[PDB]
Amino acid sequence: MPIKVGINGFGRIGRMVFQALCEDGLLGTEIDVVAVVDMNTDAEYFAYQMRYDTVHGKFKYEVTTTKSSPSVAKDDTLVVNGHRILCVKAQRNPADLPWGKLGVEYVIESTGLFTAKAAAEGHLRGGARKVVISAPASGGAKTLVMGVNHHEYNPSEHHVVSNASCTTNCLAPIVHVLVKEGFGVQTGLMTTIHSYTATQKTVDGVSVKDWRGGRAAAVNIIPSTTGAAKAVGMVIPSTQGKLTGMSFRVPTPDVSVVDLTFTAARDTSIQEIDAALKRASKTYMKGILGYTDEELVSADFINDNRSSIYDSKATLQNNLPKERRFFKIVSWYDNEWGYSHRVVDLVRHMASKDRSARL
Amino acid sequence: MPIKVGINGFGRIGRMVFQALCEDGLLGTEIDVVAVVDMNTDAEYFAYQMRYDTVHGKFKYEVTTTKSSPSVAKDDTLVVNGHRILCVKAQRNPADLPWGKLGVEYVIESTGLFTAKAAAEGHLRGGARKVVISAPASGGAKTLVMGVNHHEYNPSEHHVVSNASCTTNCLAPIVHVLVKEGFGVQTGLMTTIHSYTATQKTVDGVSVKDWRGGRAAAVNIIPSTTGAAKAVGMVIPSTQGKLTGMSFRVPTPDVSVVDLTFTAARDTSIQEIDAALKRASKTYMKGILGYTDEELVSADFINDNRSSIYDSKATLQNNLPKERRFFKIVSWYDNEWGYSHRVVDLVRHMASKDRSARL
Amino acid sequence: MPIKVGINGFGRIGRMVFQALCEDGLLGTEIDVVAVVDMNTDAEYFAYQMRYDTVHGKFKYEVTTTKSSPSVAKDDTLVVNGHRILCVKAQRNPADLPWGKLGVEYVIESTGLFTAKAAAEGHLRGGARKVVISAPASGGAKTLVMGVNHHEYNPSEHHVVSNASCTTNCLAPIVHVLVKEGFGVQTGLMTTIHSYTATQKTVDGVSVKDWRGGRAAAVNIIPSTTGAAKAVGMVIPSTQGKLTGMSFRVPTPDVSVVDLTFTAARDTSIQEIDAALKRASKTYMKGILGYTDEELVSADFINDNRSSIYDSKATLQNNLPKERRFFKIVSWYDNEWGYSHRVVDLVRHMASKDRSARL
Amino acid sequence: MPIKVGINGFGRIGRMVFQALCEDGLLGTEIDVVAVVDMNTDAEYFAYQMRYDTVHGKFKYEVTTTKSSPSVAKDDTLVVNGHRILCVKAQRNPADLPWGKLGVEYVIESTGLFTAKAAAEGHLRGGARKVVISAPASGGAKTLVMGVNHHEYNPSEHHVVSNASCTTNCLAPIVHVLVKEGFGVQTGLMTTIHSYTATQKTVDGVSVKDWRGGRAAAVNIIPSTTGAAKAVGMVIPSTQGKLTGMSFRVPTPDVSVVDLTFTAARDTSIQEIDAALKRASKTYMKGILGYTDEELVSADFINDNRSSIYDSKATLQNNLPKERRFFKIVSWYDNEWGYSHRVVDLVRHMASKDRSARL
Ligand SMILES: NC(=O)c1ccc[n+]([C@@H]2O[C@H](COP(=O)([O-])OP(=O)(O)OC[C@H]3O[C@@H](n4cnc5c(N)ncnc54)[C@H](O)[C@@H]3O)[C@@H](O)[C@H]2O)c1
Ligand SMILES: NC(=O)c1ccc[n+]([C@@H]2O[C@H](COP(=O)([O-])OP(=O)(O)OC[C@H]3O[C@@H](n4cnc5c(N)ncnc54)[C@H](O)[C@@H]3O)[C@@H](O)[C@H]2O)c1
Ligand SMILES: NC(=O)c1ccc[n+]([C@@H]2O[C@H](COP(=O)([O-])OP(=O)(O)OC[C@H]3O[C@@H](n4cnc5c(N)ncnc54)[C@H](O)[C@@H]3O)[C@@H](O)[C@H]2O)c1
Ligand SMILES: *C(=O)C(=C)CCP(=O)(O)O
Ligand SMILES: *C(=O)C(=C)CCP(=O)(O)O
């Protein structure tokens, strides 16, 4: 019994999540992506967008389009591995989405227009049973980070949840190892050298909610506030109020890195931390936290499925010698790729626990 | 008193058109910028946007703000060395703007939303007497290129006109010299290696009307159709149907280059052509057509106010020796700066003609 | 039966050629890269340079290192998928290389510092027999272009050949089709919007031989002269003195595009030419000349091993309607990748016309 | 009378120093560049590089060229705004330079190859009474940072000094105010988001002594160690062993920013720290340390001559609320412009103390 899934908003964020799901080999097997709602319904265009990608290369599977019924001008259905995905048109209120009629049980909310728990809940009225906001959320939606606290998902209590942000999914795994291994965190500050994104502008333009963010993205280092570090406190309560940080948007299309500076809760050493991080990578954090000890640069992390990738050499080479509390930890993350898989990983976990709850 | 002007759409062109005004010592004497309209009326933001430009440097003149009336919450007025500009709130429809209440006789239309003559005439209903669309128009609006056919402005017939595009303003001057000097243009094709603009995207995004135009701007050479070359047959009638061309959007925030290939109407040489352009540059095309014979690159043309800078060295070193018909002409232009000065020149020319006609 | 090859100058093209050779699965079966010579001998550093590529992704095969003999300090042997390559030291003079000791006949010259057929001939008196210059050659060295004139190879007359340039390899196939098809070419000028290369500078720097080429590469559009067009005349004598052109280095790491403007030797149509290029691609030019009809941009050609990919839409949409002589043809090419595969395709041709023609 | 100066190594930094020297209007009156020795003699080329800059705009002073004496073959003299500057040929040893013959007492060592105190000594044997190394130096050379410890310059003891690096000139002022204002530094880690430099490469190349540094510069976030932090321990001894940090080279041609994270020596608040830095920039750090409180990005610091420009908004908005020990401070710098002005400043300072010590 495959999972009936619907993706609300088939923008750049939605596609990656769908491509993620495909590469893992879940389409038509584990997950039945029934539909994808969006303001556009030209499947031929959606096929072109999946087929090519400036940063992630060419799609692994062939993509064809077709009509849902002979009585349709331009194709309105996506085809991948014989799996048919219907392209539905956007709706003002999520409650008006044909979710029930479509049989969609799990809807991936990625429009960025419904990050408020209450709003995202509309999908439920529209017939959905569970929603995953593919970004930070307000209103009190349960926030879950794979590999950190996803086992806290409660089928009967959590119907609208958030998979947090791509940056939190990079930082949290590092902090989670520190708090779980006993190094602990007294206070911390994080900085993320972040690739520019879709909200930024090519040339200087109007951006009322963030003036710096309206400046030419590919030719500027653009400072920015962020809530990713504070959010780690929701996934790991013991760090609430002890962490925060910023972001520097730099001229790269994809891939970012985490620069965490913190004071451990007890004497330790950078080598001791290096070992703990590596060890966790091969054990309880496998698939979520990985590491590298080669001379890598941002391009070498394009398409890496891990949420966080510890940079051993950079860490070990840039810490105070013989220091026991004040440390720096560098960890990479393909902001688009890692997160997209986490979103899929989370839907499968939820489905799994919802399933075992009806026995 | 000075010409009362209003700027609808304070973006790249609106602001650079303004810089041109201040720079040339026209503000308060020849031209009076009564107001500027954009998404908000928050002068502080307008000031910040004018004060700093990532490609054209810091505004050399001091900009401050004030309120039009204490009954106002936030400052809504810009002050540039004692000159006051009211920040009017954007209107979906031009006819709604308070041009009348402001005494605006000339309005620069630079939002990129009302390039249709019919839509632009909304400003006249608002109390404006003339309008210059800072882009190619449709609906039968007269098109004018300073240095080429601007003396075709008919005070009592043309009320809503178009100052063409940046590319046409770079091309036309060249073709005009070719036709006037008697070399002639039998057939021609041009390619413009163009800098990205506000219409493009930072990361692969949605662009139903121009699929290629939706791909990441600063990491792709993006082909694109353009009417710039065809529009020349609308300014230089004898070229109608003989020219056209394409564009290649590349990773630079500003400055572009026209690469024109053509067959002359008679036997010549690239040397004779070189001489003529240089000559016109120093004479009847001065101010509009300039030239360089140095090893310059795009950044070297940032802030050049001519409409076309003939690149002599590049032209002379890349043509068929002894050829007498098939030629290539390379010419640069600061797509933002040059064109913005042209808009101002156009308004001033219209204001003098208008006075003459009312004698 | 495994041949014998030796790459001199293991840089971008050297590694791209070696990688190309592996991609086609020739490492061991048909080709056997005996050894490679470059700057240092740090086998560890070579492998790292092979594992990761900023634009071409991560290498397909697994790479590791060992020692040719315990007698040597650091490693000096690559173990790509099993094969064993030796990192012989590089000499300032090609003659000083021990190609005889290792017995290497076919030596890929990719250092980019030995163009003269005399200097790049030292490989012969150094032990090697046949030498291939991965770049335009001088001193009268036979120039060959797969799909165009590579059959003009004389086993006993040609011992130091050239594979031409990336650009020549992209332009030639188009010209070839045009000529061979009967359209013919009276005159033609070509412009290539080209990505920056290793010879350029990250920031404005010294470059006596080419001032423009000395300016900041990733932020400027830089003009340059090129021989590519004239070079075609050497490969298709029918066009000698009929073609020339220039380049424009733009802010992209790889992938370029040719923009050819020409007058046919007879009356035709852009449609009749479009059809022939497509036909030639599927037939006698397959593998050398490809084509697309989708909304592609530079990034979409990354890793395309065709020498020239004709852009049907960019072409059919940008030519003069009803024209029959003056035309514009657009064709792409991964300057690093395509040329690399051609180098292998050539080295293999220079072998099949030896073991089947004299053995 | 005017300070007779010489600039060994007229590379980019050598040029920036000269332009800065001119920008301060010191050329001819308060300092005269007798000559500028470099590996190249092509004065015309010198005039070209000085005339245009892809990031700093066009030179505000006219530069022409002539011969020192009709007997001289090519032009060997640069004529700047009137002042005459000779282009001497480079030597293998400073002592071989005509410094004394020319009457050059202060030589600006910026060839980057005479870093060693002993090496840089040769200039003294040649006649020069003082040498300033425009970069970190070794061999027991006095390191001086304007506004921080330049008053530690000993006329008769320090004849060969270092002006440190761009980064140290940004961090030092910040730390200096922290220490001088009574906050103190217990421990500190610094991260600099740094724009690429001349030693990096356009495409993946060879960097035997820095694998990451060899990767494509304008398309990667490239990690890197740095001495700036530790180097501060020379200027401000109390911090020795307390500070260290790294670097992240990003896709920008110029302008960088320091991200400092530290623990104060006493309890404070970010407000208190913020107020102090501002007060200091307005007083004893005037000209060296500046601050901003506007929404600025990298482009806005281009041509800023301060050594460090504190970012108040970014600092205040990104620190732990109510924190009293663990803080983060953000400060910008035009790694090319600021440092170039400091160099000039150091020479002017020395020249001053040297004379007052013998009056
Ligand atoms: N930038 C160039 O190189 C260039 C050169 C020549 C001509 N043009 C033309 O100028 C026009 C504007 O181009 P741009 O580069 O300045 O783009 P831009 O996006 O920078 O400027 C457009 C501005 O209009 C504002 N706006 C949007 N809707 C509005 C409304 N209803 N009322 C008032 N303001 C509104 C936007 O906030 C924006 O600031 C376009 O038509 C373009 O084709 C651009
Ligand atoms: N990359 C391209 O776009 C391209 C495409 C086709 C042909 N080519 C031609 O290939 C040649 C090299 O181009 P590239 O892009 O690979 O440049 P590159 O700089 O990346 O490669 C050249 C390599 O040779 C090494 N080298 C220098 N002197 C050497 C010596 N004496 N012995 C051994 N190695 C030495 C350099 O360290 C460098 O790694 C040039 O002739 C170029 O015209 C380049
Ligand atoms: N560019 C910056 O951001 C910057 C800022 C501050 C300090 N520095 C320091 O400056 C030095 C390099 O300056 P750059 O970054 O401007 O590099 P650059 O490559 O632009 O300058 C090097 C110049 O030195 C010339 N040169 C080399 N050896 C020479 C010799 N023997 N005689 C004469 N000329 C010679 C070269 O021709 C070249 O023009 C390094 O020590 C660097 O740490 C650089
Ligand atoms: C000049 O830059 C132009 C008018 C290009 C078209 P647009 O994208 O509208 O700026
Ligand atoms: C291939 O040969 C290239 C690296 C392009 C050289 P050019 O045609 O001069 O841009």
Ligand SMILES: *C(=O)C(=C)CCP(=O)(O)O
């Ligand atoms: C300032 O940018 C530095 C710390 C030195 C730059 P470079 O020596 O070119 O790496």
